């Protein structure tokens, strides 16, 4: 009757960039996970903290779905303790991560002949991101001590780089829509539990 | 505040992100042109190519703003040093455009030169396929003579004034790059200066190429003598049993390979070589199965399978559509883990063997795909072809062909077939080593200024007689540029890679076969179904340019430097046969004799 809008999340016509990943709070609904783990369309279902079994006995206040597109080679970086450009500069998962990371190749959707550069990743940052932190700042990155004055010169680099996504790239350099389900519990009454 | 090692790392990360995309567009555009020859694709390839070329020069100029000595990371320094190679940029704008005018003029002369038959006036022929057919199949002394002399009179004389200006500008470019000369610049491909215990010098290359050449002379002397004795039957006159070999009478136009002398000089002509072409067509083999069986070869030794994108994107056969494709067998590392092979694969044994060769290039490309963008190459300029060449060695052996059912189970190898096989390998492998050594020795000294311009052709033909046992059919009077008649000399290509690769080739094979527990002659070895051999080779393949070639070579063969004993061991059954066949023949040559002396 009242199903959660997981279709509007997984089957969304367009995903956000990894640096500006879109977060949705799925609540006030009944979630059906049968079409998730029993579906062969997902090339990655590495779930951390909790397992798909023994799921009906847990209550979570809200469900957070972090949707973004990254390279296939960078799918391994969406995991606690990982190191890389995506892990440190774009999207960092907490070490105490409780949720399932769902990824699947989107070469048919997110790759075009000639390149699809609508997805950008923060190539440079002054420090590593905090867990679940989103950084949309787009100021010129200073490598050395020479000021940049808002224009990119030498040792002055624009922090955002655009993914080149062609359908002919190798499976490592291919778009992978990653949906990270984060389950949060607090002192709330926890209306949404799941029978 | 921040070390210069961090600045170059950040510079490399910015470079790598944009180099990956721009090179891929250049690589993808070049692939589209190579798999579809249309005028629009040429402009698309050039615009994509020029954008990548312009970007690289901009980054190279910025890379030279960082001090190279103030770097402690070996991996980072190799990337910056590769990027800091200014090249012809150091020349003035006046000279730089003049140099490119000279280089393009020589390439156009070489690709549009036409030697003309003196007897038939309107019989001018291009090198390919016109003069190459004459120099590879004809057995007439005069027919091979005018084609040989015509190519050097018509084209070499048009390259002599250009080559003299070419030498002066390339030396000025090299001396601007703090090199002794342009030859020293070319020897920098083998130089390793930062890994203690594996350092290699540009001068050490001369001392090592010379050392290996003095060890192949006795093998080459008997091969030279046996070929000369057999060529006496084909050419009773115009040759001397104690003299040298006329230059035109060799396998091809320059004598680079003796492979086309196999019919004239075959040891046992009554017993043919192993040819599985007929069996493949009788077993319903297609281009897909050739690359599938080639893939099975690398899986048996433990190398990874071909990617799914490889099968979807590669042009493994000539299309049935009307699109024009030049299908010289090449392996493509476009970028973004996009590995493709384009080949007009027919159902033949040669296409079966080169499928393992080209897939050997792809397996090399797949291995160092995890290396940074600037470190995705072979250990040196001779490693990439050495790895591909040893794949055809194992595939062509009767042991391998019997396992894949291309030979009858009861097929028995003959001793007079191993001799015929080894002799045909010596024509290509051993017949080219003196030629390759002499040509690079000449250019190194010409660039060094040891050969004055009034003695270029005087020392070219005195070294071709002393080192190669090859004598000019007709005298030349310094108005020629005989070396410039070759592709790699007119088109600015280093030629020593064809020498070191041959040494690396059998050095790899000898080591891999010992790991494969091969018992018997080395030329009978097949590393198939030997995961130990494949994993040891894969260790060097994954290195790319991250490590010096001296360190990469040692990880496979256990020897830091080039060793030619593995090459001598490969032809040892033939060398024993050659020395027994040369008991009643004179081994060696005298420089005094020339075809035109009388
Ligand atoms: C997305 O759509 C497919 C088919 O349209 C469906 O099988 C799948 O369940 C949908 N995703 C979700 C999360 O419902
Ligand atoms: Zn090759």
Output the strand order for the largest sheet of chain A: 1-3-9-4-2
The ligands found in this model are: 2-acetamido-2-deoxy-beta-D-glucopyranose, zinc ion
Q: So what's the oligomer here?
A: heterodimer
Order of helices and strands of chain B: HHHHEEHHHHEHHHHEEHHHHHHEHHHHHH
How far the N terminus sits from the C terminus of chain B, by CA atoms, comes to 79 Å
What is the chain-wise order of helices and strands of chain A?
Answer: HEHEEHEHEEEEE
- The shape of chain B is globular
Task: Report the β-strand fraction of chain A as a percent range.
Answer: 15-25%
The largest sheet of chain A is: 5 strands, antiparallel
Total strands of chain B: 6
Helix content range of the residues of chain B, please? Answer: 55-70%
Number of helices of chain A: 4
Sketch the major β-sheet of chain B: 2 strands, antiparallel
Continuous helix count of chain B: 24
Strand order of the largest sheet of chain B: 1-2
Enzyme class (chain B): hydrolase
Membrane topology (chain B): Single-pass type I membrane protein
Catalytic activity (chain B): angiotensin II + H2O = angiotensin-(1-7) + L-phenylalanine; angiotensin I + H2O = angiotensin-(1-9) + L-leucine
Binding site for Zn(2+) (chain B): 357, 361, 385
């Amino acid at each position: 009757t009242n199903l959660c809008p997981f279709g509007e999340v997984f089957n969304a016509t367009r995903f956000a960039s990894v640096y500006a990943w879109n977060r949705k709070r799925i609540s006030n609904c009944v979630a059906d996970y049968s079409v998730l783990y029993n579906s062969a369309s997902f090339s990655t279902f590495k779930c951390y903290g909790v397992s798909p079994t023994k799921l009906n006995d847990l209550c979570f206040t809200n469900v957070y779905a972090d949707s973004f597109v990254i390279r296939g080679d960078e799918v391994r970086q969406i995991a606690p303790g990982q190191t890389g450009k995506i892990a440190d500069y774009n999207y960092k998962l907490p070490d105490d991560f409780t949720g399932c990371v769902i990824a699947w190749n989107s070469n048919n959707l997110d790759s075009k002949v000639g390149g699809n550069y609508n997805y950008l990743y923060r190539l440079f940052r002054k420090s590593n991101l905090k867990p679940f932190e989103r950084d949309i700042s787009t100021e010129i990155y200073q490598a050395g001590s020479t000021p940049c004055n808002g224009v990119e010169g030498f040792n002055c680099y624009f922090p955002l780089q655009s993914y080149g996504f062609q359908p002919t790239n190798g499976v490592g350099y291919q778009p992978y829509r990653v949906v990270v389900l984060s389950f949060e519990l607090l002192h709330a009454p926890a209306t949404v539990c799941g029978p | 505040r921040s070390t210069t090692e961090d600045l170059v790392k950040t510079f490399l990360e910015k470079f790598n992100s944009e180099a990956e995309e721009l090179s891929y567009q250049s690589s993808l555009a070049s692939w589209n042109y190579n798999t579809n020859i249309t005028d629009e694709n040429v402009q698309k390839m050039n615009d994509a190519g020029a954008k990548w070329s312009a970007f690289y020069e901009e980054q190279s100029k910025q890379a030279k703003t960082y001090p190279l000595e103030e770097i402690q990371d070996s991996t980072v320094k190799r990337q910056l040093q590769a990027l800091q190679h200014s090249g012809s940029s150091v020349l003035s704008a006046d000279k730089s455009q003049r140099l490119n005018t000279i280089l393009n003029a020589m390439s156009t002369i070489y690709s549009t030169g036409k030697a003309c038959n003196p007897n038939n006036p309107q019989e001018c022929l291009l090198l390919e396929p016109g003069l190459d057919d004459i120099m590879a199949n004809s057995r007439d002394y005069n027919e091979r003579l005018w084609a040989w002399e015509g190519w050097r009179s018509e084209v070499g004389k048009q390259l002599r004034p250009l080559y003299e200006e070419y030498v002066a500008l390339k030396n000025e470019m090299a001396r601007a790059n703090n090199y002794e000369d342009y030859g020293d610049y070319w020897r920098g491909d083998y130089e390793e200066e930062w890994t203690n215990g594996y350092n290699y010098s540009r001068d050490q290359l001369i001392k090592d190429v010379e050392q290996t050449f003095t060890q192949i002379q006795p093998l080459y002397e008997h091969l030279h003598a046996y070929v000369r004795a057999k060529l006496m039957d084909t050419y009773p006159s115009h040759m001397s049993p104690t003299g040298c070999l006329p230059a035109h009478l060799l396998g091809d136009m320059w004598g680079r390979f003796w492979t086309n002398l196999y019919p004239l000089t075959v040891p046992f002509g009554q017993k043919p070589n192993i040819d599985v072409t007929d069996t493949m067509v009788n077993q319903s083999w297609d281009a897909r199965r050739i690359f599938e069986e080639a893939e099975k070869f690398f899986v048996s030794v433990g190398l990874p399978n071909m990617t799914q994108g490889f099968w979807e994107n590669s042009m493994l056969t000539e299309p049935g559509d009307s699109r024009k494709v030049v299908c010289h067998p090449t392996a493509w590392d476009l970028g973004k883990h996009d590995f493709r092979i384009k080949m007009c694969t027919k159902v033949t044994m040669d296409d079966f063997l080169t499928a393992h060769h080209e897939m050997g290039h792809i397996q090399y490309d797949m291995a160092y795909a995890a290396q940074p963008f600037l470190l995705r190459n072979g250990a040196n300029e001779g490693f990439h072809e050495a790895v591909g060449e040893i794949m055809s060695l194992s595939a062509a052996t009767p042991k391998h062909l019997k396992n894949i059912g291309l030979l009858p189970p009861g097929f028995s190898e003959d001793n007079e077939t191993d001799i015929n096989f080894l002799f045909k390998q010596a024509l290509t492998i051993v017949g080219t080593l003196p030629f390759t050594y002499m040509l690079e020795k000449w250019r190194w000294m010409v660039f060094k200024g040891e050969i004055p311009k009034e003695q270029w052709m005087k020392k070219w033909w005195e070294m071709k007689r002393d080192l190669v046992g090859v004598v000019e059919p007709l005298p030349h009077d310094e108005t020629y540029c005989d070396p410039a008649s070759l592709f790699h000399v007119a088109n600015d290509y280093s030629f020593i890679r064809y020498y070191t690769r041959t040494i690396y080739q059998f050095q790899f094979q000898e080591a891999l076969c010992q790991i494969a527990k091969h018992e018997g002659p080395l030329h009978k070895c097949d590393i198939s179904n030997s995961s130990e051999a494949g994993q040891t080779l894969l260790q060097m393949l994954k290195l790319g340019r991250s490590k010096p070639w001296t360190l990469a070579l040692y990880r496979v063969v256990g020897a830091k430097n080039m060793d030619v004993r593995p090459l001598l061991n490969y032809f040892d059954p033939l060398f024993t046969w050659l020395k027994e066949q040369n008991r009643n023949s004179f081994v060696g040559w005298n420089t005094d004799w020339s075809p035109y002396a009388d």
